[PDB]
Amino acid sequence: KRVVKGEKSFFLQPGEQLEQGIQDVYVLSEQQGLLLRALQPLEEGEDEEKVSHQAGDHWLIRGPLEYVPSAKVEVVEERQAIPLDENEGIYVQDVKTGK
Amino acid sequence: KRVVKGEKSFFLQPGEQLEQGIQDVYVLSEQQGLLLRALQPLEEGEDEEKVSHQAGDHWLIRGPLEYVPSAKVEVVEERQAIPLDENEGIYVQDVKTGKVRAVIGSTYMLTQDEVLWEKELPPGVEELLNKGQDPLADRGE
Numbered sequence: 001k002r003v004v005k006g007e008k009s010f011f012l013q014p015g016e017q018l019e020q021g022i023q024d025v026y027v028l029s030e031q032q033g034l035l036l037r038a039l040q041p042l043e044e045g046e047d048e049e050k051v052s053h054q055a056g057d058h059w060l061i062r063g064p065l066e067y068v069p070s071a072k073v074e075v076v077e078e079r080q081a082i083p084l085d086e087n088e089g090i091y092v093q094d095v096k097t098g099k
Numbered sequence: 100k101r102v103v104k105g106e107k108s109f110f111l112q113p114g115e116q117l118e119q120g121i122q123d124v125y126v127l128s129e130q131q132g133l134l135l136r137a138l139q140p141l142e143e144g145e146d147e148e149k150v151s152h153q154a155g156d157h158w159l160i161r162g163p164l165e166y167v168p169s170a171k172v173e174v175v176e177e178r179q180a181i182p183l184d185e186n187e188g189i190y191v192q193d194v195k196t197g198k199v200r201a202v203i204g205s206t207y208m209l210t211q212d213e214v215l216w217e218k219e220l221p222p223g224v225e226e227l228l229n230k231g232q233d234p235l236a237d238r239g240e
Contacts, residue, residue: 039126040165054163056128095182096129098206
């Protein structure tokens with residue numbers, strides 16, 4: 001597969017095909033995040049540092065940004081921030097450790 | 100038999116055949132593991148060290164990894180990690196030795212040769228556990 005993003009007009013050459021059609025890019029505020037798992041060992045240098053991810057790793061994207069998924073990356077779930085007043089709280093469970 | 104993995108396009112030459120078709124590779128997080136038994140003495144150097152396995156050996160694979168089964172390896176069971184809160188636990192039984200114990204605290208995936216044990220209680224004690232919560236509270240009846 002091959003991912004094409006941006007302003008671009010092209011013809012589908014004989015053999016090529018779109019997977020699901022023309023898709024719109026994820027656009028995210030700071031109240032919004034994406035949970036998305038790797039499928040292969042991959043690298044992505046968005047900032048100066050390089051984040052690596054092994055074959056089954058989930059991770060969380062967040063912030064004012066636009067994100068287009070890679071071919072090696074599947075998107076699992078869209079998250080939102082929970083607006084917590086001071087002296088209000090939730091009970092989270094870190095399921096890797098259990099705490 | 101012969102196992103072909105990866106991005107590859109080929110023709111089935113005259114005589115050849117697929118065993119069950121185009122199959123998708125096992126992909127595993129750290130909450131997931133595979134139990135899979137050998138059928139012949141085999142070697143596999145995934146890391147620098149070499150693990151050997153005799154003809155009937157089960158073992159457990161775990162982690163962020165992708166795994167394609169060998170022709171000498173049969174897959175028995177898919178495991179998941181049990182999310183255990185602190186001060187919560189399960190009763191595992193190592194069936195090679197027999198020693199049932201209690202593993203309490205962190206999350207736990209049952210290794211090779213471990214099974215879940217069931218703790219039964221004497222009659223009426225379960226009625227005391229579920230019904231009577233706080234004997235300072237509901238001690239009236």
